[PDB]
RNA sequence: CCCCCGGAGCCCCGCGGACGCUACGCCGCGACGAGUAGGAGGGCCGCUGCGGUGAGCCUUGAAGCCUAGGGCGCGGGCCCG
RNA sequence: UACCCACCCGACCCGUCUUGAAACACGGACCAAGGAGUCUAACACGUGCGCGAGUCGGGGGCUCGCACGAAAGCCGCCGUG
RNA sequence: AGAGGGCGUGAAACCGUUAAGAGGUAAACGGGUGGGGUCCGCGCAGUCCGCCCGGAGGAUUCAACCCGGCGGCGGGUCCGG
C-alpha cells in the first residue's frame, strides 16, 4: 500500500537530498521535487510525469499504467507532445483531469509543463 | 512457511502476523462507512481580531 | 581485550528481519528507493530458469 | 553507545555532573557495603530488615537432588495430555477415566488449586495433597501412587 | 491593605473598564470582548447577552 | 536586472553584530567563537551592566525572512548537474549555488545550464 | 512581573508512540483522525492507549476476557484490547468470542477460531463501529508485573508487608535482626 | 494472510516461460525497517577483531 | 413542473479536493520566558571510522593553510570569493 | 556585519574554594599539539522489540579453504539447564 | 627551487620591513553613530518582470470538425472466462 512505502521511504530513500535547511526528491516523475505524500513517484500506484523530450523540443507525459505494478519494466508508460504551449499546456489538463487520473498533481504537472517550454526557447541577450 | 502451515524446514515457525491488514488507510477514511459518522470540518481560520 | 565486541538476538527477531527483508525485495518502489536501477526489468520477483544453476 | 551518553552533555559543564561544593572523591561512604552496623544503619535496617545474625539450623553438604520435588496444580493437569484425550472423554459412555502420569511430564507432587473438570480420571504421581485427593475423589476418580 | 488601593466605583468608572480593557475569560483564554456573541456565549445561561447585560 | 525573487519582504535582523566570546580579544589562544561563561563570579554570565552580551533564542530572525539571501532566494548547495534540475520548480523562491571543489569545466556546464531554465546562480561568474 | 509558580505547567503525557514500527504509526494515523472527529469518547480512549508503553498496556489473558463477556447483558458485543491475548492453559469451554487486539499469541489464535469466533484488527474494527459501537474496552491487571511487589512503603517499617530485593531466598537470607523478634526486634 | 498471485517464470534468455509458479506467502510478511535495522547492528557486531592496547 | 453542478458558477458546495498534506507536516488562538549546584530535551552543532547510498566531487587542482573578499544561522558553526 | 580612526554613555581580570573575590586570597608570560566520567561484571527501575505460561541461550553439534566468515544458517539439540 | 641537501604542506606565538590611520589619563572592551579606507555589487537608466487584453505591423500551419490507426482512463452488464 502506499501508505506503507511512505513510511520507509520518509527518510532512509536513495533519491532524497536533505541540504542549507531543505529538503528534496530527485525521483524520475515527481513534479517540483518534493519530498511528500502527494508528490512522490514511486510510492503511488497512479503517477503523472512531466519531463522535457529528449530532443530538446516538446515535452513528454508520464502516466503510470495500474494495470500491473511490480512489472517495471511496462507498468508505466510514456508520450510525447510538440505542439504550441497553450494547446500542449491543455492537452495535460485534459490527461490529468476528465481522466480522474490523480488531479493532485493536475496543476503541478501544468507547471511543469510551462516550465519546461521556458527552457527551450532563446537563452538570453 | 506459508501462513496456514508449518514451515517444515524448521523445527516451529510460522510467518508473522499483522498488526493490521489493509495497511492502507487512505481507502479507510473515504470509505462510506467512516464518512457517514464524521463531524462536519471546521476550516475558517480565525486571524485574530483587532481590538479597537 | 574483553570488551562485550559481539552481539546476540532471539532466533525468531533474526528469523522475522528476514521476511521483512525479502517482502521489501517484491514492492519496486522500496527497491528502486535503495537506488537499484530497476527501471526495464520485467517483472520485480523476477525469476529465472534452473539452467544458471 | 558513547554518542548518546550524559557525559556528552556535560563538555564545558565545569564540575561534570557531580557539583562543586562536595567534589566527587574516590570512597566517601565506605567501600561496598560497609559499615551496615555503623553509619550506614538507617539503610540497611529500613531497606534490608533481617540481614544481620544467625538463624535456624545447619545442615552441612546439603544436596538439592535428595529434596527435588516440582508440583502441579489441578488448575493444568489435562494440559499435560494432549487435549483429544479429554476430548475423548467425556463421552464414550464407559467411565474411561484417562492415566495421567504426572510422572512422565517431570512433576513429583501434585497439589490442589484451582478448578477440575467434571471428568474421571487416574492420576500418578508420588506424593499427594489432601484437597488434591478430595477434588479428584470427589470429582470421581482415583489417585494412585508411584515410587 | 498595604499592597492595594480600593474604593467605590462610579458608573463612568464601570463603563471605562469594561469597554476600554475588558477581556472575558473564555476556554481559560484572555480574549478581547469585541463582539457581544462572546459574552452570551458564556454567560448566556443568567439573563446576560450583551455588553451592557454584563455591566448591570 | 537577473531572476526577480517571487516575494521581497523587508528583511529586518535585530542584531547584525556576531557574538564574540568573553576575553577573545586580549588572550590569542581564545577564538571568537561563543561559549557560554560558566564562572561563578563571571561578569558577563551574570548579564552585569555594559558587558557583551549573550545570546538568546528571543534574538532571532523572523520565520518568514530567516536562511534569506539579500536578494530574497535561499541557497541550494548544487553540486553537478543533475541536483540543478531539483530547483527546476522551486526556483523563484531560491536559488543555486555552485559547490567549492567543482572542477572549472562543468562549473561551467551548471552556469548556462541554469540559465537556461531560469535558476539564478550566486557564483556564476566565478572561475573562468 | 507575574506570580505563578512555572513548575508543573507542562503537562507530562505521551502524545505520540515512542515507538519505531510503522505499523502502530500507521493506525495511530488512523485514530489521530477519528479521535478529533467523532464525539466518541471511544477512539479517545483508543487513541490515548496506543501511545502507552509495553509494561502500561499489559496482557489479557484469555480467561479474563471469559469471565468480563460472561456478566449479564454485554453479550453479542466485541472485546476491544489495546494489547495482547495471551492463552489460559486453566480454562477449557471457550465461548465464542469477537475480540480485536494488536496482538494474539498463536495459540489463543486457534483456541478462538476453533469455537466459531472471529478476530480483528484495529483498522477492522474502525469500519466495524466507527463510532466503538457495542464495544467492551478492557485490560490486563497494571498492577500485575512482579516489579510492583517491591514498591510501598518500605521493608521493615511497621506492618507495612513489601519484598525486598535478595539476592536469592533461603535460610541465612534476610531472617535476623528486624525480623524474629528474638533476634533484635521485628517490624 | 493477504491474497498471492502468480509469477512468471523467464527463460534463460529475456522473454516469458510458460512456468507461472505463484507468490510465496513470505512476500506478504510484514515489513519492518524497525526490526531490519536493529537485528542488522547487532549481528554486523559479530563479524569483527579485538582491537586493544 | 418546482428538472441535470462534466456544470450552481461558486462566501458553501455534503459529487472531487489546498498551494498547504515531509500527518513525527502545516495552521489558529491564548498565556508566559531571572538563574548557580543539578536534571531533562533538542541540536541539516562539530571530530574520526565502518555498513549503506549520493550514475557525488577531484591534475580544467582534493585535504590542509591563508585571506580590510559576499553572506546564512539566536549559536555550535556553516556556506561561498 | 567585519579593517583603521573618532566621539558620548557604560565598563575592575579571568578560573576557583567561598556567607562574601576587582581583591593586600591562590593558579595563569605567550603560542602550538597532547589532556580527564572509561570498559567489564552485578543488580535496580524506565524505555524499545520478539515470543508469550512460557521463553531463551550457552556450551556443544551439523554446514569451509572465510574473500566477504573467524559471519550467516540449521539441530527430538530447546531444556540437560 | 614561492621543492636547494634537516629541502612536501608550511599554521600561531614572535620578529622584520612596506602601506594606512591614530596617539598627555596603560591598554583592551560593550552600546550607539560618524569619518576614512580596502574591496564588493553596480549603472555609462536598474527602470525589475510575468499574464491576460486592445491596437498596429510581419510570418508559418493548425487547432474547432470529421475519417484511419495506435495507446490509455474510467464504467458498468460481473456479460463471458
Ligand atoms: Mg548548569
Ligand atoms: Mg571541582
Ligand atoms: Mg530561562
Ligand atoms: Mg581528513
Ligand atoms: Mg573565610
Ligand atoms: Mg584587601
Ligand atoms: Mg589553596
Ligand atoms: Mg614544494
Ligand atoms: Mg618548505
Ligand atoms: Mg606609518
Known sequence: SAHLQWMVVRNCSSFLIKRNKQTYSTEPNNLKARNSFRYNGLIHHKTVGVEPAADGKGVVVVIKRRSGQRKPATSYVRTTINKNARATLSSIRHMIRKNKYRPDLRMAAIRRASAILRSQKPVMV | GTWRKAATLKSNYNLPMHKMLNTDLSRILKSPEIQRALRAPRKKIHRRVLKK | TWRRWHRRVNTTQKRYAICSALAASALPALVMSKGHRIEEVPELPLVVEDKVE | ??????????????????????????????????????????????????????????????????????????????????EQTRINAAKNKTGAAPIIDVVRSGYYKVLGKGKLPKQPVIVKAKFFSRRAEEKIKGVGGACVLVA | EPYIAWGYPNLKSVNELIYKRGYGKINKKRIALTDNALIARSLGKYGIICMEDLIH | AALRPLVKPKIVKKRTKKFIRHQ????????????????????????????????????????????????????????????????????????????HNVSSKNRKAIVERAAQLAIRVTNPNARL | ??????????????????????????????????????????????????????????????????????????????????????????????????????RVSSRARSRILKAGGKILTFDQLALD??????????????????????????????????????????????????????????? | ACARPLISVYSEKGESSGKNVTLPAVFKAPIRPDIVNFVHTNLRKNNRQPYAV
Not at chain 6, 528571543?58 to 540543478?84: D, I, W
Not at chain 7, 502502530?24 to 494515523?29: A, C, H, S, Y
Not at chain 7, 471469559?66 to 469451554?93: F, H, N, S, W, Y
Request: glycine content about 10%.
Open chain 4, 1 to 82: 553507545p558513547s554518542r548518546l551518553r550524559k557525559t556528552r552533555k556535560l563538555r564545558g559543564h565545569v564540575s561534570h555532573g557531580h557539583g562543586r561544593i562536595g567534589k566527587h572523591r574516590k570512597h566517601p561512604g565506605g567501600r561496598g557495603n560497609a559499615g551496615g552496623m555503623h553509619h550506614h544503619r538507617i539503610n540497611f535496617d529500613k531497606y534490608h530488615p533481617g540481614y544481620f545474625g544467625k538463624v535456624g539450623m545447619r545442615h552441612y553438604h546439603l544436596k538439592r537432588n535428595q529434596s527435588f520435588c516440582p508440583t502441579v496444580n489441578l488448575d493444568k493437569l489435562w494440559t499435560l495430555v494432549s
Open chain 6, 24 to 99: 577573545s580579544d586580549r588572550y590569542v589562544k581564545i577564538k571568537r567563537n561563543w561559549r557560554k561563561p560558566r564562572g561563578i563570579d563571571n561578569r558577563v554570565r551574570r548579564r552585569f551592566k555594559g558587558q557583551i552580551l549573550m545570546p538568546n533564542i528571543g534574538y532571532g530572525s523572523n520565520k518568514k525572512t530567516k536562511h534569506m539571501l539579500p536578494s530574497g532566494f535561499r541557497k541550494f548547495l548544487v553540486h553537478n548537474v543533475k541536483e540543478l534540475e531539483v530547483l527546476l520548480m522551486c526556483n523563484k523562491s531560491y536559488c543555486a549555488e555552485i559547490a
Open chain 7, 1 to 102: 512581573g507575574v506570580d505563578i509558580r512555572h513548575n508543573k505547567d507542562r503537562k507530562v503525557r505521551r502524545k505520540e508512540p515512542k515507538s519505531q514500527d510503522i505499523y502502530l504509526r500507521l493506525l495511530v494515523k488512523l485514530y489521530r483522525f477519528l479521535a478529533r472527529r467523532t464525539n466518541s469518547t471511544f477512539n479517545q480512549v483508543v487513541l490515548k492507549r496506543l501511545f502507552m508503553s509495553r509494561t502500561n498496556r499489559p496482557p489479557l489473558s484469555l480467561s479474563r476476557m471469559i469471565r468480563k463477556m460472561k456478566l449479564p447483558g454485554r453479550e453479542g458485543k466485541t472485546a476491544v484490547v489495546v494489547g495482547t491475548i495471551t492463552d489460559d492453559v486453566r480454562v477449557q469451554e471457550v465461548p465464542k468470542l469477537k475480540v480485536c487486539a494488536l
Open chain 7, 129 to 187: 463501529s466507527p463510532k466503538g459501537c457495542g464495544t467492551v474496552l478492557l485490560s490486563g491487571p497494571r498492577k500485575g508485573r512482579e516489579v510492583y511487589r517491591h514498591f510501598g512503603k518500605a521493608p521493615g517499617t511497621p506492618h507495612s508487608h513489601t519484598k525486598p530485593y535478595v539476592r536469592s531466598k533461603g535460610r541465612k537470607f534476610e531472617r535476623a535482626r528486624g525480623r524474629r523478634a528474638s533476634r533484635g526486634y521485628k517490624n
